[PDB]
Design a protein around this ligand. Structure first.
Ligand SMILES: CC(=O)N[C@@H]1[C@@H](O)[C@H](O[C@@H]2O[C@H](CO)[C@@H](O[C@@H]3O[C@H](CO)[C@@H](O)[C@H](O)[C@H]3NC(C)=O)[C@H](O)[C@H]2NC(C)=O)[C@@H](CO)O[C@H]1O
Ligand SMILES: [Cl-]
Length: 129
């Protein structure tokens, strides 16, 4: 599923990400835009052999099991394929644990390099929230 911007904003708010760990909704929408272009099916291989999955490009070295990332963890206790669903529940629940793990939203490379320190409020402009 390719979410609309305000569509994804509304789904993220419903699942409790607006101001989760202090990060306003626009941060999460901006992160998803540059991680996945709002595409729940997005996957990308990393040089270390891990893969990033879904709307928030959650990585198989730490967070989910894809059966092909040796010596990895599965800290969200979930198959990585669950992160590709049109329903973002699994991705949001896993994202909550990631952003709680010490480094905040810096865990998302695209957020650090493209959203952090910008006017992220613009990402929810016009949305009926
Ligand atoms: C969205 C996503 O999947 N992002 C991936 C990152 O999560 C990952 O970064 C590494 O994440 C682990 C787990 O959060 C980091 O470990 C934590 O490090 C902090 C100290 O910095 C410590 O407080 C935590 O206890 C520790 N958690 C553990 C050990 O479970 C680790 O620092 C991150 N590594 C780096 C190089 O930033 C990166 C890299 O694999 O991938 C993203 O895609
Ligand atoms: Cl980047």
């Amino acid at each position: 599923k390719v979410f609309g911007r305000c569509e994804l904003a509304a789904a993220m708010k419903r699942h409790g990400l607006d101001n989760y760990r202090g990060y306003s909704l626009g941060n999460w929408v901006c992160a998803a835009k540059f991680e996945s272009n709002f595409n729940t099916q997005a996957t990308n291989r990393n040089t270390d052999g891990s893969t990033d999955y879904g709307i928030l490009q959650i990585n198989s070295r730490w967070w989910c099991n894809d059966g092909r990332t040796p010596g990895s963890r599965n800290l969200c206790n979930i198959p990585c394929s669950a992160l590709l669903s049109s329903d973002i529940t699994a991705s949001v629940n896993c994202a909550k644990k990631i952003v709680s793990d010490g480094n905040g939203m810096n865990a998302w490379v695209a957020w650090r390099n493209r959203c952090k320190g910008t006017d992220v409020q613009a990402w929810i402009r016009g949305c009926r929230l």
